[PDB]
């Protein structure tokens, strides 16, 4: 008797939970996040089935901030991904949809172009990876009025002011890009390359714990909502420009 634990919530996590529901394999999906993706939020099944024998109990990238029991089967990412693992379990064999969400997991972009998506399936995988992110509509158009009246080209860099909460509405839009600098009036995010050139401006103006990055070709850093006032962030942005001279 199978038994998964979902995590944080993205279009492969909203493509297992379907596999599972039709393979009629039970789950518990308690609408997780990233930021809450804890194998201790679902203490209540790991007392009532870990460690009794006829249960596995596999845990679908779940951060494991407690003891696992012994009958836990880790499924993350090192390589085959969460879907594709699952799908081999429980020998699912993948449609196509199926398999540019596990391409889109793993690599963005270039991963579903790899595997020769045309640009209206793109549209549509990344379209459908900002709805189970929890982008809303109105992001989506802000995105759009953002793009389109507060998109400021400057050397290479891409400067684009907006009100939206959620940034990947503009991201994907932009794609493909080398730099882009997104900011409002409570935040700022700079995506591409020069990261630690924008790291030296961001310190000269708040602590370290304040600043999220992350590395590589889709690498970003940004700065935690409200952590800066907004005269600051003005100022950060003119630096940013000022470093195309
Ligand atoms: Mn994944």
């Given at each position: 008797?199978?038994?998964?634990?979902?995590?944080?919530?993205?279009?492969?996590?909203?493509?297992?939970?379907?596999?599972?529901?039709?393979?009629?394999?039970?789950?518990?999906?308690?609408?997780?996040?990233?930021?809450?993706?804890?194998?201790?939020?679902?203490?209540?099944?790991?007392?009532?089935?870990?460690?009794?024998?006829?249960?596995?109990?596999?845990?679908?990238?779940?951060?494991?901030?407690?003891?696992?029991?012994?009958?836990?089967?880790?499924?993350?990412?090192?390589?085959?991904?969460?879907?594709?693992?699952?799908?081999?379990?429980?020998?699912?064999?993948?449609?196509?949809?199926?398999?540019?969400?596990?391409?889109?997991?793993?690599?963005?972009?270039?991963?579903?172009?790899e595997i020769g998506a045309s640009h209206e399936e793109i549209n549509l995988?990344?379209?459908?990876?900002?709805?189970?992110?929890?982008?809303?509509?109105?992001?989506?158009?802000?995105?759009?009025?953002?793009?389109?009246?507060?998109?400021?080209?400057?050397?290479?860099?891409?400067?684009?002011?907006?009100?939206?909460?959620?940034?990947?509405?503009?991201?994907?839009?932009?794609?493909?890009?080398?730099?882009?600098?997104?900011?409002?009036?409570?935040?700022?995010?700079?995506?591409?390359?020069?990261?630690?050139?924008?790291?030296?401006?961001?310190?000269?103006?708040?602590?370290?714990?304040?600043?999220?990055?992350?590395?590589?070709?889709?690498?970003?850093?940004?700065?935690?909502?409200?952590?800066?006032?907004?005269?600051?962030?003005?100022?950060?942005?003119?630096?940013?420009?000022?470093?195309?001279?």
């Amino acid at each position: 008797k199978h038994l998964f634990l979902l995590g944080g919530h993205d279009l492969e996590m909203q493509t297992i939970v379907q596999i599972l529901t039709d393979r009629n394999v039970i789950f518990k999906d308690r609408y997780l996040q990233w930021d809450n993706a804890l194998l201790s939020q679902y203490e209540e099944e790991i007392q009532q089935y870990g460690n009794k024998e006829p249960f596995i109990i596999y845990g679908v990238e779940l951060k494991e901030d407690i003891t696992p029991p012994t009958n836990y089967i880790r499924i993350d990412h090192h390589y085959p991904s969460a879907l594709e693992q699952v799908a081999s379990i429980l020998d699912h064999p993948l449609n196509r949809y199926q398999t540019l969400v596990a391409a889109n997991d793993k690599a963005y972009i270039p991963g579903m172009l790899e595997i020769g998506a045309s640009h209206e399936e793109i549209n549509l995988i990344r379209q459908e990876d900002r709805k189970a992110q929890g982008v809303i509509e109105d992001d989506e158009k802000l995105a759009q009025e953002a793009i389109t009246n507060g998109t400021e080209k400057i050397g290479s860099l891409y400067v684009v002011f907006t009100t939206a909460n959620k940034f990947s509405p503009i991201c994907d839009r932009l794609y493909p890009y080398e730099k882009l600098l997104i900011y409002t009036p409570n935040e700022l995010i700079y995506y591409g390359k020069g990261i630690n050139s924008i790291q030296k401006i961001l310190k000269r103006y708040t602590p370290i714990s304040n600043i999220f990055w992350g590395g590589g070709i889709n690498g970003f850093i940004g700065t935690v909502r409200n952590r800066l006032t907004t005269n600051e962030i003005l100022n950060i942005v003119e630096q940013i420009k000022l470093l195309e001279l």
